Design an enzyme around this catalytic site. Structure first.
Site, PDB file in Angstrom:
ATOM      1  N   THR A   1      -6.657 -17.497   9.363  1.00  0.00           N
ATOM      2  CA  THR A   1      -7.031 -18.354  10.488  1.00  0.00           C
ATOM      3  C   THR A   1      -7.122 -17.621  11.821  1.00  0.00           C
ATOM      4  O   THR A   1      -7.364 -18.247  12.851  1.00  0.00           O
ATOM      5  CB  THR A   1      -6.083 -19.546  10.648  1.00  0.00           C
ATOM      6  OG1 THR A   1      -4.783 -19.079  11.028  1.00  0.00           O
ATOM      7  CG2 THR A   1      -6.024 -20.355   9.351  1.00  0.00           C
ATOM      8  N   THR A   2      -6.891 -16.307  11.814  1.00  0.00           N
ATOM      9  CA  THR A   2      -7.061 -15.507  13.027  1.00  0.00           C
ATOM     10  C   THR A   2      -7.891 -14.303  12.633  1.00  0.00           C
ATOM     11  O   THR A   2      -7.983 -13.964  11.455  1.00  0.00           O
ATOM     12  CB  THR A   2      -5.747 -14.924  13.604  1.00  0.00           C
ATOM     13  OG1 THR A   2      -5.263 -13.889  12.739  1.00  0.00           O
ATOM     14  CG2 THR A   2      -4.698 -15.993  13.780  1.00  0.00           C
TER      15      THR A   2
ATOM     16  N   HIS B   1       0.297 -13.028  19.445  1.00  0.00           N
ATOM     17  CA  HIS B   1      -0.445 -14.192  18.947  1.00  0.00           C
ATOM     18  C   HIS B   1       0.511 -15.226  18.357  1.00  0.00           C
ATOM     19  O   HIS B   1       0.237 -16.430  18.372  1.00  0.00           O
ATOM     20  CB  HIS B   1      -1.447 -13.757  17.867  1.00  0.00           C
ATOM     21  CG  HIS B   1      -2.381 -12.680  18.317  1.00  0.00           C
ATOM     22  ND1 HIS B   1      -3.285 -12.859  19.344  1.00  0.00           N
ATOM     23  CD2 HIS B   1      -2.530 -11.400  17.904  1.00  0.00           C
ATOM     24  CE1 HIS B   1      -3.948 -11.734  19.545  1.00  0.00           C
ATOM     25  NE2 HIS B   1      -3.510 -10.833  18.685  1.00  0.00           N
TER      26      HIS B   1
ATOM     27  N   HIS C   1       3.366 -20.759   8.092  1.00  0.00           N
ATOM     28  CA  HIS C   1       2.563 -20.045   7.106  1.00  0.00           C
ATOM     29  C   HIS C   1       3.397 -18.945   6.452  1.00  0.00           C
ATOM     30  O   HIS C   1       3.847 -18.023   7.136  1.00  0.00           O
ATOM     31  CB  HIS C   1       1.339 -19.424   7.789  1.00  0.00           C
ATOM     32  CG  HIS C   1       0.329 -20.437   8.220  1.00  0.00           C
ATOM     33  ND1 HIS C   1      -0.634 -20.150   9.158  1.00  0.00           N
ATOM     34  CD2 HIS C   1       0.171 -21.713   7.787  1.00  0.00           C
ATOM     35  CE1 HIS C   1      -1.354 -21.251   9.275  1.00  0.00           C
ATOM     36  NE2 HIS C   1      -0.912 -22.223   8.467  1.00  0.00           N
TER      37      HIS C   1
ATOM     38  N   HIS D   1       2.341 -21.662  13.989  1.00  0.00           N
ATOM     39  CA  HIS D   1       1.301 -21.957  14.976  1.00  0.00           C
ATOM     40  C   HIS D   1       1.834 -23.249  15.593  1.00  0.00           C
ATOM     41  O   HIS D   1       2.307 -24.120  14.870  1.00  0.00           O
ATOM     42  CB  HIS D   1      -0.061 -22.216  14.328  1.00  0.00           C
ATOM     43  CG  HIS D   1      -0.613 -21.036  13.600  1.00  0.00           C
ATOM     44  ND1 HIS D   1      -1.459 -20.105  14.165  1.00  0.00           N
ATOM     45  CD2 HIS D   1      -0.380 -20.608  12.334  1.00  0.00           C
ATOM     46  CE1 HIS D   1      -1.708 -19.162  13.239  1.00  0.00           C
ATOM     47  NE2 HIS D   1      -1.073 -19.427  12.115  1.00  0.00           N
TER      48      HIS D   1
ATOM     49  N   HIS E   1       5.122 -16.962   9.707  1.00  0.00           N
ATOM     50  CA  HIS E   1       4.961 -17.187  11.129  1.00  0.00           C
ATOM     51  C   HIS E   1       4.580 -18.645  11.297  1.00  0.00           C
ATOM     52  O   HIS E   1       4.398 -19.372  10.310  1.00  0.00           O
ATOM     53  CB  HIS E   1       3.844 -16.312  11.709  1.00  0.00           C
ATOM     54  CG  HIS E   1       2.515 -16.517  11.046  1.00  0.00           C
ATOM     55  ND1 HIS E   1       2.099 -15.829   9.927  1.00  0.00           N
ATOM     56  CD2 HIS E   1       1.530 -17.408  11.314  1.00  0.00           C
ATOM     57  CE1 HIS E   1       0.905 -16.318   9.559  1.00  0.00           C
ATOM     58  NE2 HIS E   1       0.515 -17.282  10.373  1.00  0.00           N
TER      59      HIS E   1
ATOM     60  N   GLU F   1      -2.739 -26.214  12.364  1.00  0.00           N
ATOM     61  CA  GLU F   1      -4.091 -25.718  12.145  1.00  0.00           C
ATOM     62  C   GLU F   1      -4.758 -26.684  11.169  1.00  0.00           C
ATOM     63  O   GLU F   1      -5.821 -27.238  11.457  1.00  0.00           O
ATOM     64  CB  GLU F   1      -4.021 -24.292  11.601  1.00  0.00           C
ATOM     65  CG  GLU F   1      -3.306 -23.367  12.587  1.00  0.00           C
ATOM     66  CD  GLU F   1      -3.772 -21.936  12.502  1.00  0.00           C
ATOM     67  OE1 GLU F   1      -3.595 -21.314  11.440  1.00  0.00           O
ATOM     68  OE2 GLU F   1      -4.322 -21.431  13.502  1.00  0.00           O
TER      69      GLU F   1
END
Ligand SMILES: Nc1ccc(C(=O)c2ccc(-c3ccc(S(N)(=O)=O)cc3)cc2)cc1
Ligand SMILES: [Zn+2]
Length: 261
Positions: free
Chosen positions: A199-200, A65, A120, A97, A95, A107
């Site tokens: 958020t996941t 992911h 994040h 995004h 990590h 995000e």
């Protein structure tokens, strides 16, 4: 999560998550759009305290992911406190995004503006003993979000960029010691804060979000490497790891507070 099948594709992406994770339509979901004119300055917010002097990274992992740079959180090192937080939160991993294009990837958005990526730094409340117990609490995690824009390279990010070749596919990991997360922070610690969620999936509503106003700059070459990663595992059809971001969710009954005027 051995049976999870969510992702960012057309048939398993964000719009599908609610089927297996009903909390996806909850009251405090993340990310959200930060309306800078409506966010109110809160003089009661204390200065943010980011103490990463003793941070000790251990490994970098492609989890299918995103990729996580993991830290040894068995001792009181690398802590986030102050700001809107009560207590001490320990850094466990960071990590990013990102998008398939420089025009998208973050995000959170600022007045609907989308940045090229978003970092994040995930921390858990030490009052709960461990990460697993913390995510089950409303004030279990504190995630420091930092926007990335494309321009000058970020020297501190290069060690990460160069190791990505070794973890191209899902499930691959590599030793990643002595990485200093202080090299990924912007100059200013001015921020916006609000109560939200992961958020996941599992999308747990356990996060106090602290999003910095000042983005960091990374080079086109640096983000291009992020886009060469794979969502798939080795030996499977190649699906580039791009657009692994969840779009802004309804703010509902929440107020975003600013640490600055
Ligand atoms: N009871 C639980 C124990 C572990 C876990 C996890 O493995 C887990 C996986 C992902 C996440 C996570 C962390 C941060 C973010 S984010 N993108 O909001 O920063 C998303 C998911 C948290 C916990 C979940 C529930
Ligand atoms: Zn994230």
């Amino acid at each position: 999560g051995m049976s999870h099948h969510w992702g960012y594709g057309k048939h398993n992406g964000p719009e599908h998550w609610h089927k297996d994770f009903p909390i996806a339509k909850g009251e405090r979901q993340s990310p959200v759009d930060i309306d800078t004119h409506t966010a109110k300055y809160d003089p009661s917010l204390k200065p943010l305290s980011v103490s990463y002097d003793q941070a000790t990274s251990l490994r970098i992992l492609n989890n299918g992911h995103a990729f996580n740079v993991e830290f040894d959180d068995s001792q009181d090192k690398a802590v986030l406190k102050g700001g809107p937080l009560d207590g001490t939160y320990r850094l466990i991993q960071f990590h990013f995004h990102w998008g398939s294009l420089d025009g998208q990837g973050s995000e959170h958005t600022v007045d609907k503006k989308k940045y090229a990526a978003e970092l994040h730094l995930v921390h858990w409340n030490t009052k709960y003993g461990d990460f697993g117990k913390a995510v089950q609490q409303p004030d279990g995690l504190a995630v420091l979000g930092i926007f990335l824009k494309v321009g000058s390279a970020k020297p501190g990010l290069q060690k990460v960029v160069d190791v990505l070749d070794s973890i191209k596919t899902k499930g691959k990991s590599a030793d990643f010691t002595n990485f200093d997360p202080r090299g990924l922070l912007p100059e200013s610690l001015d921020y916006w804060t609000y109560p939200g969620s992961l958020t996941t999936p599992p999308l747990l509503e356990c996060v106090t979000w602290i999003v910095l106003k000042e983005p960091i700059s990374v080079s086109s070459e640096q983000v291009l490497k992020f886009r060469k990663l794979n969502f798939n595992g080795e030996g499977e059809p190649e699906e580039l790891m791009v657009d692994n971001w969840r779009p802004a969710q309804p703010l509902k009954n929440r107020q975003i507070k600013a640490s600055f005027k």
